[PDB]
Amino acid sequence: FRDEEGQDVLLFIDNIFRFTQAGSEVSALLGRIPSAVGYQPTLATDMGLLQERITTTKKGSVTSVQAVYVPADDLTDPAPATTFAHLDATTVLSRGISELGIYPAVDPLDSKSRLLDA
């Protein structure tokens, strides 16, 4: 849609983390030594290979929104932690603020974007 049609695209991927989860899933049986937190060794590699193809080129723009599931509400998990660097605008939804009744659940602190410039 972006390149051939030359149209603006909104690629909505809901919980992109399932891709890395499936990669780590098949890696164990693929004769691959598991990485930290029992992930695939190549997690950054294939995940970046996926993420970079989502980008705005000179032929079109892709306004992609990707949800990321953090295991155990742990923001230091390798998959989301490495996914952070592949993302322009970041919206972190923590369980703590949701527990206070704020249904959007977006933790205002780590929810940061590059556009936040004067």
Which residues are near another protein by CB under 8 A?
A: 21, 25-26, 28-38, 41-45, 47-49, 51-53, 55-56, 71-72, 74-76, 78, 81-82, 84-86, 114
**Rounded alpha-carbon distances, angstroms, from residue 109 to 14, 80, 96, 115:** 23, 17, 12, 15
Query: Closer to another protein at the Cβ: 6 or 38?
Result: 38
Smallest distance, Å, CB 7 to another protein? Answer: 18
| Close Cβ partners of 60 (under 8 Å, ≥ 6 residues apart) | 1, 2, 3, 5, 6, 7, 8, 9
Considering beta carbons, is residue 42 or 66 the nearer one to another protein? 42
Shortest Cβ 84–another protein spacing (Å): 6
Closer residue to another protein (CB): 25 or 107: 25
- Write down the residue that tokens 């230091």 correspond to: 76
Tell which residue, 108, 71, 103, 65, has the closest CA to residue 87. Answer: 65
CB of 100 to another protein, least distance (A): 17
